[PDB]
């Protein structure tokens, strides 16, 4: 145990003896974006209970949402039309994902099961095609790699890589102490980051199924994790009204985005197409847009209840926000 | 919408909105309940009497043409504060205690303290069930005491307005109401008049728990409405 602490001190010291200059010193010589005005352009209605998750499609037009009454709805964001309405076996759903090819959707919650729904059948109905079982805790997140591979996060401190064709886990990702809350994929789908309630974030390798790096610094647990468009940075969000931005290669903590006027925690985080903006949904009914380079508050997206999820279109077109009052708003 | 296909899409959306309306009226007339308890408590037998590693279980019972949905949380971890945020909209919480062990009581007390003082559990009233009372009666007449665990039991008298059973032995009563108070002391120290507690004395062979839940729910909703209309 004594040796362990040594090592940890060696690792710290190695990290310490690298911070020659913070982001602010370099970035203090760039003109800011200034003020950004975003207006509500659409309003999607039809959900009964609170909304827990949403996910944009690569088509940049369709999106899927999940609510606590046990319903999945697929919208058309241009004409405000509804394409599909899917009921769930269990009403306590917590997450949903949309396939990159637009062929499948997934969901899960307080039932230890991840369900797969096929959207393209000969019959004009949506039916479940695979139920993934084996987790001990509730499912908190899920993301498709392709039409055959999916990564899930559970409340049993473990992650897993599944095989939809057979339904058996091919890799188990153990090591977290507390239950895991969120995960994020990489553009090349060779790595993924994950954050848990033990106030630590870890980087995993999909092929070798092994932990690679660890990040610390957050005072409270982690609720939402996002990834930089370039591929080398990722930003988190905690319950202590703070969000950071950690590098991969540098292995440290960069500029911190927080203010003294916020007491409530963060629920969702997302990035802009260029990485010039950082938007996060807070518990004070509001959404805060920040300058990702200078830690400047620029714009507020002002919902009558808690904001639960966010989403930015692939081409930077617009932003969709969900909330606990069962309304979806599109800002452009 | 100036094409035939667009009109057909709008029509499909309209059908979807009519299905969602019937779902909403079905939904508005149901009351949701959450059941919490330990392994020694007979919570697993009350569900049986009323009626794989899964995560949650459901049970439906009807009284006076009113539907009640009780959700029992199954195979989960030992941490509760994270998934308890999804139940801030239920009518009431049923808490089952096996107060016939003399050992497994303090942990139940801290459990009750943690549940009652939760942030996300405000406005939610709790119905207290005291189970396996006949075992307590069989464990007290022989004389395993209570003063060795609770030293203040020796300074407790039967409260003034208690009602004993008809075939009651004098002794049993003192212990039952001591446990009931011990549980009731926790609720009265906080809440500032937004939720209440409804204790009971439940046995293994009972056929009235549904009626008690109905009455407690009726009282809770009536009190909620009276406060809302500035009458309380």
């Amino acid at each position, epitope marked *: 145990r004594q040796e362990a602490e040594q090592l940890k001190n060696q690792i710290r010291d190695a990290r310490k003896a690298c911070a020659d200059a913070t982001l602010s010193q370099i970035t203090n010589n760039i003109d800011p974006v200034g003020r950004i005005q975003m207006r509500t352009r659409r309003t999607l209605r039809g959900h009964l209970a609170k909304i827990y998750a949403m996910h944009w499609g690569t*088509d940049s*037009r*369709l999106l899927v949402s999940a609510s606590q009454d046990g319903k999945l709805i697929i919208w*058309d964001s241009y004409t405000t*039309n509804k*394409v*599909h309405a899917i009921p769930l076996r269990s009403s306590w759903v917590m997450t949903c994902a949309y396939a990159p090819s*637009g062929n499948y959707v997934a969901c899960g919650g307080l039932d230890n099961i991840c369900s797969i729904y096929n959207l393209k059948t*000969r*019959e*004009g*109905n949506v039916r479940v095609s695979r139920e993934l079982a084996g987790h001990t805790g509730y499912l908190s997140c899920c993301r498709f790699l392709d039409d055959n591979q999916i990564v899930t996060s559970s409340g049993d401190t473990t992650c897993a890589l599944w095989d939809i064709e057979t339904g058996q886990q091919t890799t188990t990702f153990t090591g977290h102490t507390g239950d895991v809350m969120s995960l994020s994929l990489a553009p090349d789908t060779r790595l993924f980051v994950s954050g848990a309630c033990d106030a630590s974030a870890k980087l995993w390798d999909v092929r070798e199924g092994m932990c690679r790096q660890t990040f610390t610094g957050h005072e409270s647990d982690i609720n939402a994790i996002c990834f930089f468009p370039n591929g080398n940075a990722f930003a988190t969000g905690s319950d202590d009204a703070t969000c950071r931005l950690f590098d991969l290669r540098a292995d440290q903590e960069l500029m911190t985005y927080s203010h003294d006027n916020i007491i409530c925690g963060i629920t969702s985080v997302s990035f802009s197409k260029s990485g010039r903006l950082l938007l996060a949904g807070y518990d004070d009914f509001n959404c805060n847009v920040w300058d990702a380079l200078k830690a400047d508050r620029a714009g507020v997206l002002a919902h009558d209840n808690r904001v639960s999820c966010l989403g930015v279109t692939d081409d930077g077109m617009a932003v969709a926000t969900g909330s606990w009052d069962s309304f979806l708003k599109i800002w452009n | 919408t*100036l*094409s*035939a*296909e*667009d*009109k*057909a*899409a709008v*029509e*499909r959306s*309209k*059908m979807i909105e009519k299905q969602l309306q019937k779902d909403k009226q079905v939904y508005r007339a149901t009351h949701r309940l959450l059941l919490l308890g330990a392994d020694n408590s007979g919570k697993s037998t009350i569900v049986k009497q009323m009626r794989k590693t899964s995560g949650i279980f459901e049970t439906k019972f009807q009284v006076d043409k009113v539907n009640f949905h009780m959700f029992d949380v199954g195979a989960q971890r030992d941490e509760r504060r994270k998934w308890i945020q999804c139940f801030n909209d239920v009518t009431a919480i049923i808490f089952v205690v096996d107060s016939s062990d003399y050992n497994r009581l303090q942990e139940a007390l801290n459990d009750f303290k943690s549940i009652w003082n939760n942030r996300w559990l405000r406005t939610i009233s709790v119905i207290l069930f005291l189970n396996k009372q006949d075992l307590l009666a069989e464990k007290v007449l022989a004389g395993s005491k209570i003063e060795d665990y609770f030293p203040e039991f020796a300074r407790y008298t039967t409260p003034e307005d208690a009602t004993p059973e008809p075939g009651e032995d004098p002794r049993v009563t003192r212990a039952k109401y001591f446990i009931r108070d011990e549980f009731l002391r926790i609720s009265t120290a906080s809440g500032d008049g937004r939720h209440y507690c409804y204790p009971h004395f439940t046995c293994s062979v009972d056929t009235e728990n549904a009626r008690r839940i109905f009455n407690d729910c009726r009282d809770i909703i009536q009190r909620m409405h009276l406060r809302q209309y500035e009458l309380l």
Partner: single-chain antibody
Amino acid sequence: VQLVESGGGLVQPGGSRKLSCSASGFAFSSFGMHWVRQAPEKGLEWVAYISSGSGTIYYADTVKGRFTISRDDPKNTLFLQMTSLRSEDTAMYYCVRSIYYYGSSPFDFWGQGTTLTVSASADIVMTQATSSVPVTPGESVSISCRSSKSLLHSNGNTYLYWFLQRPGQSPQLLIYRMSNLASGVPDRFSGSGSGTAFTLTISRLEAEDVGVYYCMQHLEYPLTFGAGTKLEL
């Protein structure tokens, strides 16, 4: 997924018949239904249309007060009611599925049809350049279609279809909305156009590509077809 049609027969003039199409194997209560006519020596022609919710109904301008459509969801049966059979209703009638949402592929599955022998305007005009062409098994083929009004819509869609009924079976779907490929068709067909004139190209050539190719527009409701170009190998 299979549909069955019933009725048919020979009807004396002035009679009335009840033609029907029966669905089975899918969610029939979510698909719009059409009826399409086809004379023995002419191309296809659209008859009527009923929607999934029975709230919308169209009829062809030729017959609007004579025919009548109805549907039954609990039994999955579609009906066509014909009265005062003239000397023209001597063609083949087909029942066609269709479902309308974003990204969908209407006019996908056709039935098998029936026969009916009878004893003795401002709509878009769609025409095809030729009627037949001789080719070789392995060369490139190009079939042209033209319209009288611009099929391109303000949204960005071009409502043009290719069907290519084979010599002996019911029609199927090759290209929908002038650019997109059907589900099970081989990946050697393609389509292109500019807004008024369109072409269908077949890169390779197999023995299964013989038949008559059709050109249909779905901009307005009349639903006018083309003429047809037979290929002989």
